[PDB]
Amino acid sequence: RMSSVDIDTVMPHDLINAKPAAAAVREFFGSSQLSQFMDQTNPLSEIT
DNA sequence: GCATCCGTGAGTCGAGGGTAATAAGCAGGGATTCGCCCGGGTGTCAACTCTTTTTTT
């Protein structure tokens, strides 16, 4: 994207995607074989 | 006649409950679609006339 917009007479915070990688970190906790539901049934299961 | 490489298989019933990311712009002309309104066919009612089963004479 930096080739289209003129670099001269520009500033930051505009040539940067708002959520270019936030979805990649949000999908990790949401859908992942490792990150699973919490077994919060008793104090022993919370520690095991 | 053998050596190398590409398809099928994997039990069965039950739990558990939804998900998620990129992102030009404006000018011409038609097809589409929502508001109002006249309207003619469908209902809902005042209100004028034959028949007759007795109930009265």
UniProtKB/Swiss-Prot annotation:
Top-level division of the source organism's lineage: Bacteria
Quaternary organization: The RNAP catalytic core consists of 2 alpha, 1 beta, 1 beta' and 1 omega subunit. When a sigma factor is associated with the core the holoenzyme is formed, which can initiate transcription.
Protein family per UniProt: Belongs to the RNA polymerase beta chain family.
Biological role stated in the UniProt entry: DNA-dependent RNA polymerase catalyzes the transcription of DNA into RNA using the four ribonucleoside triphosphates as substrates.
Protein name: DNA-directed RNA polymerase subunit beta
Provenance organism: Caulobacter vibrioides (strain NA1000 / CB15N)
GN (gene name): rpoB
Shown stretch of the complete protein: 486 to 533 of 1356
